[PDB]
Amino acid sequence: SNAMILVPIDISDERIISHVESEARIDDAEVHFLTVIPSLGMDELREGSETQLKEIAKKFSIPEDRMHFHVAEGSPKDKILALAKSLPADLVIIASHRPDITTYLLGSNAAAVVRHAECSVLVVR
Amino acid sequence: NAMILVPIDISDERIISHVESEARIDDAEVHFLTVIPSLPGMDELREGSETQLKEIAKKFSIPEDRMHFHVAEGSPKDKILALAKSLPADLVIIASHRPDITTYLLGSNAAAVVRHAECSVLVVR
Numbered sequence: 001s002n003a004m005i006l007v008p009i010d011i012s013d014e015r016i017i018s019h020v021e022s023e024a025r026i027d028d029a030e031v032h033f034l035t036v037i038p039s040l041g042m043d044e045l046r047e048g049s050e051t052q053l054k055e056i057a058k059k060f061s062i063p064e065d066r067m068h069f070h071v072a073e074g075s076p077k078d079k080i081l082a083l084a085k086s087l088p089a090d091l092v093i094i095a096s097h098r099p100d101i102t103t104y105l106l107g108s109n110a111a112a113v114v115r116h117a118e119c120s121v122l123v124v125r
Numbered sequence: 126n127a128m129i130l131v132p133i134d135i136s137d138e139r140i141i142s143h144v145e146s147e148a149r150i151d152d153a154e155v156h157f158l159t160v161i162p163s164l165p166g167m168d169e170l171r172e173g174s175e176t177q178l179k180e181i182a183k184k185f186s187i188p189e190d191r192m193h194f195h196v197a198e199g200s201p202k203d204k205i206l207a208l209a210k211s212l213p214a215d216l217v218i219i220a221s222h223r224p225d226i227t228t229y230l231l232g233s234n235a236a237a238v239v240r241h242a243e244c245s246v247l248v249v250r
């Protein structure tokens with residue numbers, strides 16, 4: 001039962017990198033990157049999303065054999081929470097909001113994950 | 126531009142040479158499909174199935190940028206046929222039967238695909 005850290009990533013559009021790396025180093029945790037394709041060809045979108053997720057993950061200094069990639073479809077908050085439950089995650093690491101939006105001190109997904117996760121949550125600023 | 130559909134049962138080698146050779150003819154896209162039959166979470170089963178599908182595909186000498194992965198849920202023959210139609214496939218490549226079963230010279234999925242597919246079908250022995 002290695003530690004498992006869930007790292008949701010919005011692939012649309014760096015402070016989380018040092019935090020994920022440091023948290024992973026604590027236990028040599030498994031690091032599960034997740035991207036959610038919002039609802040409303042699917043196999044093609046999933047494939048392109050996985051490729052972009054992997055591109056982003058190259059920025060992180062984590063061993064290859066510790067990184068796992070997930071693509072979900074639907075509500076980002078619902079899927080982040082579902083995966084934190086099913087892994088189960090020992091930690092969720094999430095940015096407080098998108099870097100280019102300051103109106104809200106916590107974004108919606110961050111606020112929901114912080115409140116509803118069954119595990120600890122690190123909100124990164 | 127050419128598209129080859131290769132259904133794989135992730136429960137249970139001869140098709141490898143044929144797929145590699147057929148793919149070389151045009152530099153075809155190769156679409157691997159596995160169908161998980163109907164009755165823990167569906168999301169985790171889909172991801173677990175895709176992971177095993179990808180491990181099998183590592184046995185095939187085909188360029189990375191030509192391989193595509195699909196997971197469907199239900200009747201294998203119905204989903205094989207649905208994808209062959211919608212891609213649309215120029216070829217389906219299918220083993221005559223499961224390697225370990227000799228009583229049916231042609232398995233039931235192979236028989237339905239070779240009769241109902243709208244494209245050419247290669248039955249491999």
Ligand SMILES: Nc1ncnc2c1ncn2[C@@H]1O[C@H](COP(=O)(O)OP(=O)(O)O)[C@@H](O)[C@H]1O
Nearest residue numbers: 008009010035036076095097098107108109110
């Ligand atoms: N589509 C998505 N897939 C995966 N994670 C996401 C997605 N959207 C948001 N998140 C997670 O939530 C974090 C904050 O996003 P959010 O709470 O929606 O605020 P904002 O709307 O400012 O981006 C993101 O940094 C990301 O970790």
Ligand SMILES: Nc1ncnc2c1ncn2[C@@H]1O[C@H](COP(=O)(O)OP(=O)(O)O)[C@@H](O)[C@H]1O
Nearest residue numbers: 132133134159160201220222223232233234235
């Ligand atoms: N669940 C499945 N998903 C994708 N392809 C399948 C599945 N089951 C069978 N096939 C395809 O059909 C081929 C032959 O299977 P089938 O006709 O069921 O014969 P058998 O009954 O001996 O397994 C398999 O090698 C595979 O290519």
